[PDB]
Design a protein around this ligand. Structure first.
Ligand SMILES: [Cu+2]
Ligand SMILES: [Mg+2]
Ligand SMILES: [Zn+2]
Ligand SMILES: [Zn+2]
Lengths: 334, 294, 89, 101, 58, 148, 35, 172, 57, 59, 133, 187, 148, 110
């Protein structure tokens, strides 16, 4: 590796005429790229109606009937059909634009439940009725606290006195004075700002409470074929909201950080276990405890959710590393 | 911090990731930083200054002559609109610049000018964890710092656009393609290993390691410690995840562990000789049948 | 992994065109992580048969602080002597 | 992986290694390969020839915001500094056009 | 002469003369690219004559 | 006051940005690291703007250091900056050690008498108080008569 | 787009984005795609 | 009285906002959107463009000061903060000094682009290289730097300290 | 406006402006100030004319 | 873009196109040039709005 | 190595999970691929296609775009106001009293202003307001 | 008016549609280590030659001193110069010049000294003196590189640092007629 | 939210006896401006939702944020510079109290007053560290607390 | 050379021209445009006139700094001991700048 010597034998001014000879290497032929790639390119369909300024002769239209029909999910997606209220509002959404729905290479998923699916109900797997009462209490407390600390106190503190709070003058080194609301913001931009802020804050608080409470599972019932589990969770108005989940969607898996297993909620005997419906990337937080679950079907639900939590999550031992993966047999057939 | 391209990149992120993964010249020319470009030689008749353009008929270019040490510019800034097809000589400089029309392919011609483009920077790629370091002493010096780690186990493969759609809508096709790609990667790795072995046999080692005996002993000890720590961590993880890994005999193992620890932590103190701890003893008690083999 | 950039481009068997033969590009072959200079002074001189790359390394930079303490004694003693003389004079 | 001696001999007789492999994957190990994830990337035609992405050609929202800012500024300045409000009744044709629009 | 017609003349000749004259020069220097047509020689000369004289006259 | 009003307007802007980010995140269902970092940066900027009332505190040390004339001008001829730093470090170490493992001055005091701290001038006070403190002394005496 | 059908309705959910007199929404005002 | 003064103050505020917007839009491109070869060697760019960039930086300098002065004047006019009343602490000299700190740099930035325009016009007409491009660029930059120190020149009769007057005259 | 917008794309050799939306906003916004600063000489809070007998109204 | 050539090297107006470099019997008289057709300058292009209206139209 | 045990559902497309090692699934459906594992990305493709087209620049929320009535009203009002402002400021500055109306509001603590009259209905009524403190 | 067209609505084949065989991959890897790879571009000049041809001799057919006599006699009148020289003399002045070229040179309208200088320049640099100077290429030249190929160089027009002032054209004309709204349409 | 906002607007209008026509005009103009800004931001978000997030785009967004912060901080810097060297009457006779009018506010309450912003910053940092390992529904509580 | 090899951006901020020897024929891994403004706007470079004028102005400014403001910031309140002396010293430190008085030496010229 004497680099100078390498240079002394690498770039010689004599071989200049042959030095920059870009040569297509005569390497081994690869049928995938040297045979299959050309012929497939050679079979490219052609059209005579390319856009004069923007089209291309090989830009052929793909038939929608030739697009891959949806078989990924056995449940409908009403977001494709939208909501009548939106129609009644004539709202312009990105999930209802027909051009956006006109996928060129694939066929869009069906917006209605698949005809194979039966909507009949079966038997309840788990139930927790007092959760509704607890959630209602929490939501009512949140609403009452927001109203009190935000409106009732501000209403009196701003419109029912002339002396400001001690927090108003602790930082200002100015002579004391009284405050009145009849000589402030003559061009009342503060009124619309306060109204908009209050409306948006109330909406955000409601939506956040609904999202927080919407992950837990309040009532569950596996279907007659146990394919579509009907579950009622907590609704935003404190009521119940019913949905369905496909059997293949739910699972229980080790966390992404294997060191966090000991700090998992399900590690406790009276904890919580999350079934993750992978189809909608949804979560159903069942109470990890024996009292709430139904004895008859639990094992099957346990057998239907425990698929990735295997020995591989811990690794392979010294005697097991020999069988880590499937052996690749190459060259024994030529 | 590195984006999951299989679910995110559609057109622009697709081009950027493809450039960062394959270094295709046009692709590189797609994302070359405007701050600086690789400096080439002066344009001669035999050695034209190769100015690349991604399949564009014309490109504006300025002529500065032969730059000197004293002055960064040699000649007056004369701008010309070089067109693809033939070399053009800036008259004031006599500078022969040749336009190159880059076409999206994998031909050896693309390999000819592979060294004419500076490699793309990976610092700005991916998501960032800090808006901007508001340090006036580091305003234009260091790139943004990140709090998360960047995985390096990724192996990227290009896909035909419509075919990619078929992967996005058909999970079974995605699984089959992933298995086939893993098999292909394994085959390629085995072939590379065989090639390296053959090259070593036909040529020999490049040399001996210029390392110290103390460092060599420390490295051997470090390897042994790494193996031991890996075994210990594996045992700890196996014990911790006992409930979820196995569910049928979990009740029996838990009951046996509780009974054994009851007569070990109550009514009797446990004098532990060696590195065996209470957690290790409980783990050994739980999967008692497991440790009986290996 | 290369030290002299020329050698890096000497005979590259991992060209992207070659990489096109299998369509499998691991992140471990990123160009930005391929090669880097040695940060030492390097001058290309006209050798007897071809150019030779001479390597100038001015100062080794692995000094232990003890050595720094080893050399500082004479200067400190001279400073002390000068201060004492200027005080006495 | 596993490789057969017959295929190895056939390849060696057909191809003799005359150069080393520059791919960094040559330095990879079997466990490291087993700890790898395959990724997919759609390849299609390229249209935006810049480091930055392609941008639209119209901002009617921006134009309208600028016009509204100008109108609001004019009205507020007239009503505050000059204490004057526009008597919109004189331009009957303009008012009719605005109403019809 | 603070705050007087001398200062007024200084300010005007520095701004109205030099800056506007340079603006007109750049307009004529880039008349084609901005307008797409060649300038009108006679009327342009008349403008350059009357504008230059008026500044000094005022 | 003008600075405080500007700070209030900036705080309003930052709150509006945070609210918009929250609404968009709720609409989307997945968080963006750029958005999170931008919100964190806005909050940091607001927090930096929060400590603005300390102008008198900042003025003290700077005006004290600004009053010194040149040492070579021979007004005081004393330049003991680093000397003060080192000696004060040692003295503060000694003072902390004394406050830790020595006799601590007592803080218990009377807390239930009316105007017990309102002390008037007397022979025990030398009557060298403020020249106009006679009114305060008389009021204190009258209040003591009331509370007696 | 008055008397000249430049836009196509099948690709537009809300026809009428520009002032025109030769277009009508495929989704009628009393239409409602139901499940 | 209420009227033209307030209207002018509001117009000045609006102009300052617009100038800030324009300056951001211009300077952001020059720092980021420069071509591959025009990253740092400003001598390559035309004289008019160089003057444009320099005047944009100069405007970005004085615009916040002008805006703050306008805000203070508006507060005095409409809230009576005595920001200019000699009775309880204020001084018209402060307002005059602020206006002059916005004053002379404004004229200096205004007259700058015309020189670049003339320099660009002359070189093409004569088919010759400029006399001293680097020297002219450095002189323009030095004149811009010096314009920030001629504030007292336009207020010589305000009666500042004789040292300040002498310094202002020497800088002018 | 004119010189910068015309030349920076050409002279600086940059694609459009750094913030084209901001450039358009400023171009459309200048008219408000232009009009406001030019109406002060003819419009005053004292609207009535010298011969206007404002006492009657 | 325009691609019509409209001007090339034209002689035989004041300089004869024949080769009389060393023709002592031939004398060139530039003052006796024959009349030619006046070539008006290229008038500015007029937009074919309709086609342009189609070219700049947006779907 | 742990191989998938069995599948119990009805749709045979689910049987594809029976030929993959759990880690592989964890590799292709969890950690990095958790947000996309075992989900048909119809929504992703739809969103990308929608974003690709040159749609109306006016938007209200991430879910739905801006209201057509609001857009039309804002555009018409802006155009009419700009036209009126231009006409008045460039042509109708002669008799401002003929072309302008005087009105303003005073602070509620302060007494009602003399010019604080209802616009366009002055010839019918007179207004006054009680102060507060 | 053509209807809307979506380039992403048509399938494209920029990559093979099938995966390669394991044995084929092994063979390709074996071959890839057996043959040398094509070199990448190296910007090192091999053997530079005088770009404007050989430098003028101290004495000979056309010494540099004669060139030194040209700059002082440079002029640009409003008409062509009928001072046409005898082509043979020009041919005598520049050994290797084509006679017809001199006839073309003598028809240019320059004074005989300038004509001889232009003829010498064309003979030394191989300039094609018959190509018209237009907006696309200001001049055309033919050369023979170190690879021996007979290549053509189109010396194009330039600008005085003002691209806006540069007449960007695609025709062999002199007028500036085209006004492209986008300076960089392809960004 | 709509009920509360409408009730607040009506109560404020009734309290101020606002003129309906002028109030409606001002409110419409403000709504137009705000809606336009929000629509621009939403349009940018929707465009950057997919196939638009380049490293150039990220850098441009960071640069835009930094420029906005710098432009905002400029006026406050001028105000602080004016306030530090604030004007007053002559200290010789006119304004003698300025020597004793330090107006130094005690820091003993500043920390207690400012603690909420620090708590919010700490919660933001925790959320930024937690986003890589948490779920969208799991992190909603942090967002709610930050909003409150 | 080590700095330029390590952090090229800093080298650009330092205006250090590319020190890598590109005689090998292969282009460098990281090229950049130099910003020699710091190396130009100096008294020993093309900015000699600008730097000289700036230095002269700063010397004029430094004289104003050392003799007009800082002494004014020294004494602020009425003093019991030699207040008149301190005020006289402060004022004479500023009221006797030669630029205000040196004319009379050569007065017949004017
Ligand atoms: Cu001035
Ligand atoms: Mg004056
Ligand atoms: Zn040149
Ligand atoms: Zn740095």
């Amino acid at each position: 590796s004497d680099p100078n010597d390498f240079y002394r034998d690498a770039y010689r001014n004599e071989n200049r005429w042959i030095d920059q000879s870009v040569f297509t290497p005569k390497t081994s032929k690869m049928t995938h790229y040297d045979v299959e790639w050309p012929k497939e390119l050679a079979s490219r369909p052609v059209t005579k109606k390319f856009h004069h300024d923007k089209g291309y002769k090989y830009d052929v239209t793909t038939p929608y009937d030739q697009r891959y029909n949806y078989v990924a999910d056995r449940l409908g997606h009403p977001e494709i059909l939208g909501n009548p209220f939106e129609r009644l509002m004539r709202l312009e959404g990105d999930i209802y634009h027909p051009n956006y729905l006109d996928q060129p290479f694939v066929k869009v998923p069906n917006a209605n439940p698949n005809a194979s699916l039966n909507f009949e109900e079966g038997e309840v797997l788990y139930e927790n009725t007092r959760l509704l009462e607890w959630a209602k209490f929490w939501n009512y407390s949140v609403v009452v606290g927001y109203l009190w600390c935000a409106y009732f106190v501000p209403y009196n503190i701003f419109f029912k006195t002339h002396m400001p709070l001690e927090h108003a003058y602790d930082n200002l080194f100015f002579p004391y004075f009284q405050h009145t609301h009849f000589l402030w913001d003559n061009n009342a931009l503060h009124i619309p700002t306060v109204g908009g802020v209050a409306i948006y804050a109330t909406y955000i608080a409601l939506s956040y409470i609904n999202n927080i409470w919407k992950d837990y599972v309040v009532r569950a019932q596996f279907s007659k074929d146990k394919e579509l589990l009907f579950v009622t969770r907590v609704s935003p108005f404190g009521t119940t909201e019913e949905e369905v989940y496909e059997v293949a969607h739910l699972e229980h898996l080790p966390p992404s950080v294997r060191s966090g297993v000991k700090d998992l909620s399900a590690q406790d005997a009276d904890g919580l276990v999350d079934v993750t419906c992978m189809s909608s990337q949804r979560s159903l937080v069942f109470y990890k405890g024996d009292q709430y679950w139904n004895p008859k079907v639990y094992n099957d639900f346990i057998n239907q959710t425990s698929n990735l939590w295997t020995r591989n999550y811990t690794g392979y031992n010294r005697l097991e590393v020999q069988n880590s993966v499937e052996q690749v047999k190459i060259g024994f057939s030529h | 911090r590195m984006t999951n391209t299989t679910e995110e990149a559609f057109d622009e992120v697709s081009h950027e990731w493809q450039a960062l993964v394959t270094s295709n010249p046009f692709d590189l020319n797609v994302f070359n930083y405007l701050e600086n470009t690789q400096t080439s030689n002066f344009g001669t008749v035999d050695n034209p200054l190769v100015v690349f353009t991604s399949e564009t008929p014309f490109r504006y270019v300025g002529c500065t002559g032969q730059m000197n040490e004293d002055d960064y510019e040699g000649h007056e800034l004369l701008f010309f609109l070089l067109r693809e097809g033939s070399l053009q000589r800036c008259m004031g400089c006599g500078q022969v610049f040749k336009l190159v029309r880059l076409r999206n392919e994998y031909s050896p011609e693309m390999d000819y000018y592979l060294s004419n483009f500076h490699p793309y920077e990976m610092q700005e790629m991916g998501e960032s964890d800090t808006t901007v370091l508001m340090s006036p002493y580091k305003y234009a010096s260091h790139y943004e710092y990140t709090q998360f780690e960047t995985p390096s186990n990724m192996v990227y493969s290009m896909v035909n656009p419509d075919e990619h759609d078929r992967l996005l809508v058909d999970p079974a096709y995605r699984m089959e393609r992933t298995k086939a790609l893993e098999e292909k990667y394994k085959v390629y790795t085995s072939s590379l290993r065989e090639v390296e072995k053959q090259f070593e046999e036909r040529y020999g080692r490049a040399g001996q390691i210029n390392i110290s005996k103390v460092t060599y002993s420390t490295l051997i000890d470090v390897e042994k410690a790494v193996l031991k720590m890996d075994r210990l961590f594996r045992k700890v993880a196996k014990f911790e995840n006992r409930a979820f890994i196995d569910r049928a005999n979990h009740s029996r193992r838990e009951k046996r562990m509780l009974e054994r620890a009851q007569q070990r932590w109550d009514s009797n103190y446990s004098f532990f000789t060696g590195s065996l701890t209470e957690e290790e003893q409980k783990y050994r008690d739980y999967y008692e049948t497991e440790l009986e083999a290996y | 992994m290369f030290r002299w950039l020329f050698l890096y481009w000497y005979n590259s068997t991992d060209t992207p065109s070659a990489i096109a033969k299998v369509n499998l590009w691991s992140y471990i072959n990123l160009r930005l992580f391929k090669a880097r200079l040695s940060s030492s002074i390097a001058y290309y001189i006209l050798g007897l048969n071809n150019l030779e790359l001479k390597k100038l390394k001015i100062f080794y930079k692995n000094t232990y602080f003890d050595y720094i303490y080893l050399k500082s004694i004479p200067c400190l003693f001279l400073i002390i002597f000068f201060t004492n003389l200027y005080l006495f004079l | 992986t596993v490789i057969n001696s017959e295929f190895l001999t056939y390849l060696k007789s057909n191809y003799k290694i005359s150069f080393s492999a520059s791919n960094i994957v040559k330095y990879l190990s079997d466990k490291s390969v087993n700890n790898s994830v395959i990724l997919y990337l759609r390849k299609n035609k390229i249209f935006n020839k810049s480091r930055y992405s392609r941008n639209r050609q119209t901002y009617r929202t921006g134009a309208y915001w600028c016009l509204y800012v100008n109108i609001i500024a004019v009205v507020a300045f007239y009503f505050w500094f000059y204490k004057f409000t526009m008597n919109f009744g004189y331009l009957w044709w303009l008012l009719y056009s605005l109403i019809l629009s | 002469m603070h705050d007087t017609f001398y200062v007024v003349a200084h300010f005007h000749i520095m701004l109205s003369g030099a800056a506007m004259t340079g603006i007109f020069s750049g307009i004529y220097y880039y008349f084609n690219a901005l307008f797409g047509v060649k300038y009108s020689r006679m009327f342009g000369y008349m403008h350059l004559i009357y504008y230059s004289g008026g500044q000094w006259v005022a | 006051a003008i600075c405080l009003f500007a700070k209030f307007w900036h705080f309003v802007f930052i709150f509006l940005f945070w609210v918009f980010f929250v609404l968009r995140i709720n609409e989307l269902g997945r968080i963006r690291y750029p958005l999170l970092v931008a919100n964190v940066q806005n909050f940091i900027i607001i927090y930096i703007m929060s400590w603005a009332y300390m102008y008198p505190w900042l003025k003290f040390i700077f005006r004290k250091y600004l009053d010194v004339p040149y040492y070579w001008f021979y007004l005081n001829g004393r330049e003991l900056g680093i000397r003060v730093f080192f000696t004060d470090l040692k003295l503060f170490f000694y003072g902390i050690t004394n406050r830790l493992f020595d006799f601590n001055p007592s803080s218990i005091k009377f807390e239930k008498y009316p105007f017990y701290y309102w002390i008037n001038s007397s022979q025990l006070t030398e009557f060298n108080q403020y020249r106009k403190f006679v009114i305060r002394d008389s009021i204190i005496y009258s209040l003591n008569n009331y509370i007696i | 787009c008055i008397y000249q059908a430049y836009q196509n309705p099948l690709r537009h959910i809300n026809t009428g984005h520009n002032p025109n007199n030769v277009y009508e929404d495929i989704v009628m005002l009393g239409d409602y795609p139901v499940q | 009285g209420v009227g033209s003064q307030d209207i002018l103050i509001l117009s000045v505020v609006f102009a300052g906002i617009s100038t800030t917007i324009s300056f951001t839009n211009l300077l952001i491109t020059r720092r980021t959107l420069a071509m591959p070869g025009l990253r740092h060697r400003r001598v390559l760019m035309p004289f008019v463009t160089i003057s444009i960039f320099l005047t944009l930086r100069m405007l970005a300098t004085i615009t916040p000061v002008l805006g703050a002065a306008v805000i203070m004047m508006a507060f005095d006019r409409h809230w009576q903060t005595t920001f200019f009343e000699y009775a309880y602490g204020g001084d018209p000299i402060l307002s005059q000094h602020l206006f002059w700190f916005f004053g002379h740099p404004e004229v200096y930035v205004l007259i700058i682009p015309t020189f670049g325009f003339i320099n660009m016009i002359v070189p093409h007409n004569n088919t010759r290289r400029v006399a001293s491009k680097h020297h002219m660029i450095w002189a323009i930059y030095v004149m811009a730097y010096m314009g920030y120190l001629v504030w007292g020149h336009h207020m010589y009769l305000v009666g500042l300290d004789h040292r300040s007057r002498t310094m202002y005259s020497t800088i002018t | 406006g004119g010189f910068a917008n015309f030349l920076i794309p050409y002279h600086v050799g940059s694609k459009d402006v750094a913030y084209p939306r901001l450039n358009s906003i400023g171009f459309w916004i200048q008219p408000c100030g232009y009009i406001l600063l030019a109406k002060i000489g003819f419009l005053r809070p004292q609207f009535w004319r010298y011969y206007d007998k404002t006492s009657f109204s | 873009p325009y691609t019509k050539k409209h001007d090339d090297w034209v002689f035989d107006v004041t300089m004869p196109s024949q080769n009389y470099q060393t023709d002592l019997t031939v004398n060139i008289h530039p003052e006796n040039k024959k009349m030619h057709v006046m070539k008006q300058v290229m008038r500015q292009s007029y937009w074919d709005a309709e086609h342009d209206m189609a070219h700049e139209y947006d779907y | 190595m742990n191989r998938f045990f069995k599948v119990s559902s009805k749709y045979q497309y689910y049987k594809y999970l029976e030929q993959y090692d759990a880690a592989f699934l964890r590799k292709y459906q969890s950690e990095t691929h958790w947000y996309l594992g075992r989900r048909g990305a119809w929504k992703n493709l739809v969103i990308k296609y929608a974003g690709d087209h040159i749609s109306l620049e006016e938007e209200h929320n991430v879910k739905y775009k801006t209201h057509l009535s609001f857009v039309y009203l804002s555009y018409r009002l802006a155009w009419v106001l700009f036209a009126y402002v231009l006409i008045y400021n460039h042509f109708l500055l002669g008799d401002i009293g003929k072309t302008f109306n005087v009105g303003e509001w005073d602070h509620r603590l302060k007494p009602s202003a003399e010019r604080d009259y209802p616009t366009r209905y002055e010839s019918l009524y007179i207004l006054d307001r009680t102060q507060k403190w | 008016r053509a209807g809307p067209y979506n380039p992403n609505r048509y399938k494209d084949y920029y990559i093979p549609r099938t995966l390669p065989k394991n044995e084929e991959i092994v063979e390709f890897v074996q071959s890839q280590h057996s043959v040398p790879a094509s070199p990448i571009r190296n910007q090192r000049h091999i053997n530079p030659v005088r770009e404007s041809g050989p430098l003028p001799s101290y004495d000979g057919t056309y010494t540099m001193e004669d060139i030194r006599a040209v700059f002082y006699n440079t002029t640009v009148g409003r008409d062509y110069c009928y001072c046409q020289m005898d082509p043979e003399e020009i041919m005598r002045r520049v050994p290797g010049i084509t006679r017809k070229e001199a006839e073309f040179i003598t028809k240019l309208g320059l004074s005989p000294q300038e004509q001889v200088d232009f003829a010498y320049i064309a003979y030394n640099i191989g300039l094609d003196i018959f190509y018209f100077t237009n907006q696309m290429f200001v001049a055309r030249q033919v050369v023979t590189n170190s690879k021996g190929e007979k290549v053509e160089v189109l010396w194009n027009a330039q600008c005085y640092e003002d691209i806006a002032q540069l007449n960007v054209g695609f025709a062999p004309v002199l007028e500036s007629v085209d006004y492209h709204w986008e300076i960089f349409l392809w960004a | 939210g709509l009920l509360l906002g409408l009730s607040s607007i009506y109560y404020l209008m009734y309290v101020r006896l606002l003129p309906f026509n002028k109030i409606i005009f001002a409110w419409i103009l403000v709504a137009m401006f705000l809606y336009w800004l929000l629509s621009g931001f939403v349009f940018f978000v929707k465009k950057y939702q997919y196939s638009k997030f380049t490293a150039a785009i990220q850098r441009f967004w960071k640069r835009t944020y930094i420029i906005f912060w710098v432009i905002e901080a400029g006026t406050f810097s001028v105000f602080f510079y004016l306030t530090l060297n604030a004007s007053s009457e002559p200290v010789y006779m006119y304004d003698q109290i300025k020597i004793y009018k330090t107006h130094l506010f005690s820091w003993r309450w500043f920390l207690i007053k400012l603690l909420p912003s620090v708590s919010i910053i700490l919660l933001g940092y925790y959320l930024q560290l937690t986003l890589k390992w948490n779920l969208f529904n799991k992190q909603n509580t942090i967002v709610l607390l930050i909003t409150l | 050379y080590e700095l330029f090899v390590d952090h090229p951006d800093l080298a650009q901020w330092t205006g250090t021209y590319p020190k890598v020897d590109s005689s090998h024929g292969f282009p460098f891994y990281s090229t950049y445009e130099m910003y020699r403004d710091f190396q130009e706007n100096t008294l020993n470079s093309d900015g000699s006139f600008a730097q000289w004028i700036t230095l002269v102005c700063g010397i004029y400014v430094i004289h104003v700094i050392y003799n007009y403001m800082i002494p004014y910031y020294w004494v602020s309140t009425p003093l019991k001991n030699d207040e008149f002396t301190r005020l006289r010293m402060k004022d004479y430190i500023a009221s006797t700048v030669l630029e205000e008085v040196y004319g009379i030496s050569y007065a017949e010229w004017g």
